[PDB]
Structure 1
Amino acid sequence: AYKLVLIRHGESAWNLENRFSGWYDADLSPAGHEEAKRGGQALRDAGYEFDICFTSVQKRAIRTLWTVLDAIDQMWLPVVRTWRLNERHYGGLTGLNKAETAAKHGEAQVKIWRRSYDVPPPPMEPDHPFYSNISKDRRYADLTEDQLPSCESLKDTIARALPFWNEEIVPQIKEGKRVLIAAHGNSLRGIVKHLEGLSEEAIMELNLPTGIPIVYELDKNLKPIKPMQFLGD
């Protein structure tokens, strides 16, 4: 019965300003850092061991992983980073707060986005304040023109995250390697929806806790044998 472990990073610096970060590379707030320390301790106390870790190219996820590996004394483990585990690309809303967003786009469009699985946000246009910061970052230089989003619905995020699951994480699990994935709410949502065969409405209702190891027990077909469980007190 394979064991798989997910962890979602905690509060960021832009949460403290209630700003949409998306692909903006906000660091953890001091408290999000503390959350990751606690998640680490909870894996230490339970005696968890891994053989390989996956994360995004965003530092709130990476620092969460680093904190956990420090806590469980497995700093030596192989680490693989991919943009395909990044947060959902919130396009033109990147950097705005909720008030600014409602003023610019309307309460109507806002409710549509909050409820919808396949309606993207506005694209990040070249005049956007963070257009260069994100879409001209080196770390994305290898992506083709069609892979680099200017915005993403949840469906888009999941559609680009699941190829990485199948391509690099599934082979490790098949070999018996114990996997730890440190990433973001929306990419992990993709993983959860695929593992559990959830519906659109279901996954959009699922909200993953932060800083808490999420444990999956998988059968030989990598199908969950029971619902996800959490680690801690």
Structure 2
Amino acid sequence: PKLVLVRHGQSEWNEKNLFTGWVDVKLSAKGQQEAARAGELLKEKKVYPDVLYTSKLSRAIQTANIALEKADRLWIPVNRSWRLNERHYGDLQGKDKAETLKKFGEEKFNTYRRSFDVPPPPIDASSPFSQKGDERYKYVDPNVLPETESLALVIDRLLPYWQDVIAKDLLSGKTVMIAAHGNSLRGLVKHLEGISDADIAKLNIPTGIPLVFELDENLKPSKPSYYLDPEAAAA
């Protein structure tokens, strides 16, 4: 089994320097370009996705749409799950980062961001940046939908989908492509490579560059992961 992870490029809120989380934000004109290059890299490097897996957040869906259109594989099957979404930023969704830093000071700020298990305070259910009762999640248990998260909490809800659903295609000899987000992807990678809780903060997965994993019958790396553009990734 071969798996391919693709992290989306920058969003319209990344540009405005706002915390995103689950807020459905569009890809910036810049991020739309990294997607094309991700697709160009798939075709070029001869990595051919048999099935596609995305989150319910537009930016990642778009990235897949663009990338698969340069790769000549727009036709492949597509499943979307909330469990592949980004780490919900809680109360911090739609709040200036630079302003957050001032109001919270450098320690607390860094915790909420590069901390493994400390979630931002939860967001108010009535806030303009609350996706509580959002149409795209109406067939899911309302009680499982988070109002704030941490990388650890992201991994918890991601695994069940991976184990059941994604594993199915991998174990069926299908090359799976996941177009996800920063937290959810490092989450998948922490699990796969057995990275401990402390060391995960050090992992960075760049944007618009496919990460490829070749797994054994037990879904454990047969060899070390590799990007289709090592140069661009090490920079």
> Separation in 1 of the partners of 2:214 and 2:101?
42
Pairwise CA distance, 1:127: 4.3
Aligned match of 1:64: 63
Aligned counterpart, 2:51: 52
Contact 1:158 1:189 in 2 (8 A): no
Per-residue deviation, 1:99? 2.7
Find the partner of 1:163 among 160, 164, 186: 160
Cα deviation 1:36-60 (Å, max 9, x = unaligned): 0011011111222221110000111
1:174-230 deviation line (CA, Å, top 9, x unaligned): 110110111001111111111111101222210101100101111121110222101
Selected match of 1:179 from 173, 176, 179:
176
Deviation for aligned residue 1:107: 3.8
User: Which residue identity lines up with residue 76 of structure 1 in the other structure?
Assistant: W
1:52 touches 1:77 (CA, 8 Å); kept in 2? yes
In the aligned structure 2, how far is the partner of 1:47 from the partner of 1:142? 37
* 1:145 CA drift (Å): 3.1
Contact 2:125-2:132 at 8 Å conserved across structures: no
Q: Deviations over 1:55-103 (max 9, x none)?
A: 0001110000011111111111001000100000001000001233234
Number of paired residues?
230
1-structure distance, mates of 2:102, 2:121: 14
Task: Choose the corresponding residue for 2:212, options 208, 211, 215.
Answer: 215
Quote the residue 1:38 is aligned against.
37
Matched to 2:32, the amino acid is H
In 1, Cα distance between the equivalents of 2:228 and 2:110? 34
Please state whether the residue corresponding to 2:6 is helix, strand or coil: strand
> Which position in structure 2 is the counterpart of 1:140?
137
* Aligned mates of 2:76, 2:115 — CA distance in 1: 38
SS in 2 for 1:135: coil
Q: How far apart are residue 31 of structure 1 and its match?
A: 0.8
RMSD of aligned C-alpha atoms? Answer: 1.4
1:181 maps to a residue whose letter is: I
Distance 1:127 1:174 in 2: 43
Task: Quote the residue 2:123 is aligned against.
Answer: 124
For residues 100-137 of structure 1, give each alpha carbon's deviation from its aligned partner in whole angstroms, at most 9, with x where no partner exists.
32344444422332342111101011342312xx2221
Residue identity opposite 2:5 in structure 1: L
1:82: which partner in 2? 81
State the TM-score, normalizing by the size of structure 1.
0.94
Percent identical among aligned pairs is 51
Give the counterpart of 1:154 among 151, 154, 169: 151
Structure 2: gaps of 5 or more residues: none
Q: Is the 1:6–1:188 contact (alpha carbons within 8 Å) kept by the matching residues of 2?
A: yes
Partner of 1:17: 16
In structure 2, the residue corresponding to 1:180 is in which secondary structure?
A: strand
Q: Which runs of 5+ in 1 are unaligned?
A: none
Distance in 2 between residues matched to 1:146 and 1:106, nearest whole Å: 33
Kept in 2: contact 1:9–1:184 (CA 8 A): yes
Structure 2 Cα separation of the partners of residues 44 and 112 of structure 1? 39
SS of the equivalent of 2:30 reads helix
Is 1:200 aligned to 2:171, yes or no? Answer: no
